[PDB]
């Protein structure tokens, strides 16, 4: 249940999202990530910004120790935060992440966002990200990351890397917000044309953080069409939203800190949607990105409109 990447490595098509707001204790990320691996998750999504890499690393190592999984069976992702985009900071930031997680390599390292910040939430900065990508390329050559990609890149920002003079490695993936209300069908078409995997976050709609998400926005999992399809298939609305991405070639993440819902989310491989189901879901696209805050929308390299 993996997809082959542009650089030869493989990525599991269902990933586990580990972000919890700072009010959730970090000991939960350790328990939860162990349960995700117990449930069948082999793709685990973390980042510098998430303040959990020590716990997520320990969880992986703990399951490696108890004879459940081997390191080569786990796909660990980290992300370079936007205060570290200047090239001389890229490798130290990655080495720090491996340090926190106590791992020898990450399977995937991403530029978290194209919106550079002053060298964690400072003020904007102006960085030529082709130089940041060059430092990413060296992290792959050095073996600190098996694969390298980007996150929150729009079409123009992706093209800049692919058009870079003397590019070494193209981005393996682009991790963007993607769900039935914001399905990125044009960006998905472009990524499939360049052999770039689209990885979807907020596929269950969001954690609806009051910092960045308007509480007046519709709740994706309460959508009428998704709920009717859940009743039709005798599944849950979350499983329909996840199966929707797998059937259109999108690697999908799913955060859950609930034992029961983590186990339920791996049932996405058990059933299929029909062609009629898929256009029902495609008709829900309404250009609604849940993350909508002036802090993002004021940045010069803001990927949206
Ligand atoms: N690159 C980026 O900029 C970026 C941005 C955002 C997120 N991400 C990553 O993507 C991951 C997922 O995105 P997300 O944080 O927005 O969370 P999400 O995957 O969209 O899930 C949203 C909510 O759905 C609930 N849920 C999980 N399974 C469910 C189920 N079977 N039925 C009903 N509800 C269910 C969860 O609540 P419970 O916990 O109570 O189960 C969760 O809080 C993140 O953890 C992060 O790793 C990356
Ligand atoms: C902790 C929150 C974090 C995450 O969960 O990864 C996150 C969430 C949203 C964005 C983002 C990017 N580009 C446009 N709008 C929003 C982001 F860069 C980073």
Three-state secondary structure string covering 94-151:
HHHHHHHHCCCCEEEEEECCCCCECCCCCCECCCCHHHHHHHHHHHHHCCCEEEEEEE
Q: Give yes or no for a contact between 105 and 146, defined as CB atoms under 8 angstroms apart.
A: yes
- The DSSP H or E segment spanning 28 is helix 26-39
Residues 173, 64: Cα–Cα separation, whole Å = 27
Which ligand is the nearest neighbour of the Cα of 212? 2
Residues 170, 148: Cα–Cα separation, whole Å = 8
Query: Helix, strand or coil for residue 173?
Result: strand
Binding-site residues for substrate sit at 112
Instruction: Determine the straight-line distance between the first and last CA of the chain, rounded to whole angstroms.
Output: 35
Question: What is the whole-number distance in angstroms between the Cα of residue 112 and the centre of ligand 2?
Answer: 8
The separation between CA 22 and the C-alpha centre of its own chain, rounded to angstroms, equals: 19
Q: Give yes or no for a contact between 201 and 17, defined as CB atoms under 8 angstroms apart.
A: yes
Which DSSP letter does residue 179 get?
B
Beta bridge partners of 44: 16, 76
Q: Give yes or no for a contact between 26 and 55, defined as CB atoms under 8 angstroms apart.
A: yes
Token output for 205: 């709609």
- The DSSP H or E segment spanning 197 is strand 197-201
Sort residue 176 into left (φ over 0), alpha (ψ -120 to 50) or beta. Answer: beta
What contacts 62, CB < 8 A, 6 or more positions away? 30, 34
Q: Give yes or no for a contact between 203 and 252, defined as CB atoms under 8 angstroms apart.
A: yes
Count Cα atoms within 13 angstroms, Cβ side, for 223: 24
Count Cα atoms within 13 angstroms, Cβ side, for 206: 21
DSSP assignment string, 245-271: HHHTT-EEEEE---HHHHHHHGGGGG-
Among 80, 81, 205, 291, say which to mutate for ligand 2: greatest number of ligand atoms within 8 Å of CB. 291
Residues 133, 31: Cα–Cα separation, whole Å = 34
Q: Give yes or no for a contact between 129 and 162, defined as CB atoms under 8 angstroms apart.
A: no
Residues 25, 31: Cα–Cα separation, whole Å = 11
Burial class of 296 by CB neighbour count within 10 A (0 to 12, 13 to 18, 19+): middle
Beta bridge partners of 149: 110
Q: Give yes or no for a contact between 71 and 64, defined as CB atoms under 8 angstroms apart.
A: yes
Among 23, 47, 111, 113, say which to mutate for ligand 2: greatest number of ligand atoms within 8 Å of CB. 113
Q: Give yes or no for a contact between 245 and 252, defined as CB atoms under 8 angstroms apart.
A: yes
Burial class of 298 by CB neighbour count within 10 A (0 to 12, 13 to 18, 19+): exposed
What contacts 131, CB < 8 A, 6 or more positions away? 86, 87
Query: Helix, strand or coil for residue 75?
Result: strand
Token output for 140: 């792959």
Question: What is the whole-number distance in angstroms between the Cα of residue 251 and the centre of ligand 2?
Answer: 18
Resolution of the PDB structure in angstroms: 2.0
How wide is the angle at C-alpha 149 spanned by C-alphas 173 and 125, nearest 5°? Answer: 125
Residues 167, 53: Cα–Cα separation, whole Å = 30
Specify the experimental method: X-ray
Question: For residue 289, which atom of ligand 2 is closest to its CA?
Answer: 15
Residues 181, 270: Cα–Cα separation, whole Å = 24
Query: Helix, strand or coil for residue 243?
Result: helix
Residue count of the chain, please give it. 305
Count Cα atoms within 13 angstroms, Cβ side, for 34: 14
Catalytic residue status for 109: no
Residues 236, 238: Cα–Cα separation, whole Å = 5
Question: What is the whole-number distance in angstroms between the Cα of residue 208 and the centre of ligand 1?
Answer: 9
Which ligand is the nearest neighbour of the Cα of 48? 2
Q: Give yes or no for a contact between 130 and 157, defined as CB atoms under 8 angstroms apart.
A: no
Question: What is the whole-number distance in angstroms between the Cα of residue 19 and the centre of ligand 1?
Answer: 8
Count Cα atoms within 13 angstroms, Cβ side, for 128: 4
Which DSSP letter does residue 199 get?
E
What contacts 190, CB < 8 A, 6 or more positions away? 155, 158, 196
Q: Name which of 151, 149, 173, 176 is nearest 290 in CA terms.
A: 176
Which DSSP letter does residue 50 get?
G
């Amino acid at each position: 249940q993996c997809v082959k990447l542009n650089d030869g490595h493989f990525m599991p098509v269902l990933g586990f999202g580990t972000y919890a707001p700072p009010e959730v204790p970090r000991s939960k990320a350790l328990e939860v990530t162990k349960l995700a691996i117990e449930a069948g998750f082999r793709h685990i999504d973390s980042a510098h910004l998430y303040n959990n890499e020590e716990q997520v690393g320990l969880a992986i190592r703990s399951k490696i120790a108890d004879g459940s999984v081997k390191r080569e069976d786990i796909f660990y992702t980290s992300k370079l935060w936007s205060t570290f985009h200047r090239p001389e900071l890229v490798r130290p930031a990655l080495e720090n992440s491996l340090k926190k997680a106590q791992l020898d390599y990450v399977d995937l390292y991403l530029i978290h966002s194209p919106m550079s910040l002053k060298p964690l939430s400072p003020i904007f900065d102006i960085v030529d990200l082709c130089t940041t990508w060059e430092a990413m390329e060296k992290c792959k050559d050095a073996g600190l990351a098996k694969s390298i990609g980007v996150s929150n890149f729009n079409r123009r920002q992706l093209e800049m890397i692919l058009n870079k003079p003397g590019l070494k490695y193209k981005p393996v993936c682009n991790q963007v917000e993607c769900h039935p209300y914001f399905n990125r069908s044009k960006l998905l078409d472009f990524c499939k044309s360049k052999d770039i995997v689209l990885v979807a976050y907020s596929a269950l709609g969001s954690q609806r953080d009051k910092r960045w998400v308007d509480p007046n926005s519709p709740v994706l999992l309460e959508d009428p069409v998704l709920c009717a399809l859940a009743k039709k298939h005798k599944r849950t609305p979350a499983l329909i939203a996840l199966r929707y991405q797998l059937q259109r070639g999108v690697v999908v993440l799913a955060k859950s800190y609930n034992e029961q819902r983590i186990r339920q989310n791996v049932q996405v491989f058990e059933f299929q949607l029909t062609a009629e189901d898929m256009k029902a879901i495609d008709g829900l696209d309404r250009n609604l990105h849940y993350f909508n805050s002036d802090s993002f929308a004021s940045h010069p390299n803001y990927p949206y409109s």
